[model samples]
Target: GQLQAAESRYEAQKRITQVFELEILDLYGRLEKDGLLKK
Candidate 1:
């Protein structure tokens, strides 16, 4: 059961990562525009 739970957690994390991927790109774009992306 522990293995199953771990796999489930990984699956959930993968899905969440996919959802956040686009938002992360958009945020980077805004940061670069505001000159906050690079030091």
Candidate 2:
């Protein structure tokens, strides 16, 4: 009861959010390691 494109837009949006979230986490991790961010 499903077709791929029918859900593709929402899935793509979610993937984009996830990518950005991971990138932000990575950047924060680097900054933390550099002691630029408070623990």
Candidate 3:
């Protein structure tokens, strides 16, 4: 369960990182502009 949970978190974090990489400026700007995500 620990390993599976880590894997799931890793996958999710990977997705986040991918989005960050693809949208580096936008992501950085949004992080600065919004303070927190809309969520």
RMSD of each: 5.0, 4.0, 9.5
Model 2 collision count: 0
Could you estimate the TM-score for every candidate?
0.53, 0.66, 0.55
How do the residues 4-39 of candidate 3 rate in per-residue lDDT, one tens digit apiece?
Answer: 999999999999999878899877787887866555
Can you list the residue pairs that collide in candidate 1? none
Lowest summed lDDT window (length 10), candidate 3: 30-39
lDDT of each: 0.91, 0.88, 0.87
Q: Which residue segments of model 1 deviate by more than 4 Å?
A: 25-39
Candidate 1 Cα RMSD (Å)? 5.0
| Candidate 3 residue pairs in clash (backbone atoms < 3 Å) | none
Candidate maximizing lDDT: 1
Candidate 2 clashing pairs, residues 3+ apart or interchain:
none
lDDT of 1 by residue, 1-39 (tens): 999999999999999999899899999889788895455
User: Candidate 3 overall Cα lDDT vs. reference?
Assistant: 0.87
Write model 2 residue lDDT over 1-39, tens digit each, in one string: 367786987899999999999999999889888895455
After TM-score superposition, the amount by which residue 37's alpha carbon in candidate 3 deviates from its true location, in angstroms, is 32
lDDT accuracy of residue 21 in candidate 3: 87
- After superposing candidate 3, which stretches have Cα over 4 Å from the reference? 25-39
**What TM-score should be assigned to candidate 2?**
0.66
